[PDB]
Amino acid sequence: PEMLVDLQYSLANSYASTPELRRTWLESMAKIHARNGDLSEAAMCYIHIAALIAEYLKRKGYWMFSMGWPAFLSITPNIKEEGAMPYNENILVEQLYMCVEFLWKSERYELIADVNKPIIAVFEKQRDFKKLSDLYYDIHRSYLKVAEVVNSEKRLFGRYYRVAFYGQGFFEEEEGKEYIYKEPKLTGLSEISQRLLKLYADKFGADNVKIIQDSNKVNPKDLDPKYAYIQVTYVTPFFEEKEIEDRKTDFEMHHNINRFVFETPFTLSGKKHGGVAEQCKRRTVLTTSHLFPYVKKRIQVISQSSTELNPIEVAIDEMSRKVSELNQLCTTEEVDMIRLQLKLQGSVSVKVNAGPMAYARAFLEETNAKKYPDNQVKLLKEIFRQFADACGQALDVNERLIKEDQLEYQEELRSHYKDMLSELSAIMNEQIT
């Protein structure tokens, strides 16, 4: 029970002590990780052990990893932790093999060449050519795998969640701390929140632990002192446009990440939900203390910032997102018909929700236009144009895919789209395709 406090307990133990305890405890953390399935945190453990041994050996004057821990800086910048404090070279390598075994089991294949690079150099010096060839073949199989699965739906690296604990005389170490929890991937909010509640409730008693579903910043003054609280919120990794440029692959999107983001709805009326003219949205970027992957699967959030989006900014955003997603769905080589029809019908024929023309009416009308900042309406006018574009492009795409038991569905999608054009015009007074 509570494998998460166990890791942190062992980890807190690996400081204020000797090199060998630090090692001993990282190894222990690793066997907990392994058996809990957090295979990347077992690999990050072995790689920290490795850099520990390297650093200790360098400092003892025993001599690539003769550099120190910087040898491993490209696996992860967390490794700089090892720079503060009867080993030998064959032990160092054996730890690096543990790492490689677990990069393999954690499907973070792209690091196998880098963790192997120093080992090759040890075996260059001893002219052990057969072991060199094994090392090279291994790296080869490693990129073979990467080539097989990279940038596809096969590899599942994790789903991330903010978790924050609040209860004065309940939590003891995590009290007031806010964390990011890296969960085995495709883990749902339902799974993690219910798992946390059952853990801490076995700790404090059945109905003394409350889930906080609101995602606003918790002020403790408003907390019923009679309970322990756990705020749980889905977050995804956050990147600036520059960063999004610099990371090509899915693995690259999950490697060395310390920033996460989540969106909270609210209305200027101070409520949580409302119509498109007053419903706003806040975007909050949490920053951890250490990048993922790390030797533990939860990392404290040390800082935070947020920005707020206008009703019209909420619309500029979601329409841009919608144009892109439909374009993208129509560039693809072998277009998935059901997903196509799903997103198309959900744009041109909505019957449960307001519809794109709700934004068109609220923000693009001449009177309501006077209300909002001008160049923002101009932006949304263009975006709405491009939107009609992508909708027509998809409506044509799908006509090819039809198996003729869906014709009348397709006329009706088309006819609804033509009405949507008519209205969009009368709001903007343009020919609109």
């Binding site: 599942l156 495709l186 339902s190 219910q194 909420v314 799903l342 024929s349 019957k351």
Partner: protein, 178 residues
């Protein structure tokens, strides 16, 4: 890189749209950013292998009566929805929804789904329910019905407590595959 068509049907206030929004954006019901668009999509892992389950939200009003069944062909799986604290949505399951879907799609499997199971224990709900001589719908009654109308099975869930949530869509996909 595949996709599964699931059509959702039922009355409107039974919180079915809240089920799909909450599950497919991993947010609690009080926290989703509302969207002007219909039709949600979710990746689900099952038996170790991902799928893209696509959820076509139908409106349950008696106006889209002529246009709703244009959304029916190419369906792999159906979810008929009712609230367990709403006995009219239950009889409407028997009288309109399962008759319609099986008339258009006799061979397509469907699943009875109860929602709002958290209110079944909510005192104020049971009080407004009892005052009209009504009781909520119990599990054993919902399951006796799923058997009698030949649904694949009955699944129930709570979008607000998340209990049973994942399983509704996992059993949906399981229904879709065979």
């Amino acid at each position: 890189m595949q996709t599964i068509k699931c059509v959702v049907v039922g009355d409107g206030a039974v919180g079915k749209n809240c089920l799909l929004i909450s599950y497919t954006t991993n947010k609690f019901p009080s926290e989703y950013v509302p969207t002007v668009f219909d039709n949600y999509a979710v990746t689900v892992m099952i038996g170790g292998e991902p799928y893209t389950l696509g959820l076509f939200d139908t409106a349950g009003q008696e106006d889209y009566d002529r246009l709703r069944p244009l959304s029916y062909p190419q369906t792999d799986v159906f979810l008929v929805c009712f609230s367990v604290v709403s006995p009219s949505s239950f009889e409407n399951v028997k009288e309109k929804w399962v008759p319609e879907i099986t008339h258009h799609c006799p061979k397509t499997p469907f699943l009875l789904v109860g929602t709002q199971i958290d209110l079944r224990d909510d005192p104020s709900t049971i009080e407004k329910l009892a005052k009209n001589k009504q009781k909520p719908i119990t599990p054993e009654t919902a399951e006796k019905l799923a058997r009698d109308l030949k649904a694949v099975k009955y699944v129930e869930c709570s979008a607000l407590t998340q209990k049973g949530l994942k399983n509704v869509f996992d059993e949906a996909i399981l229904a879709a595959l065979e």
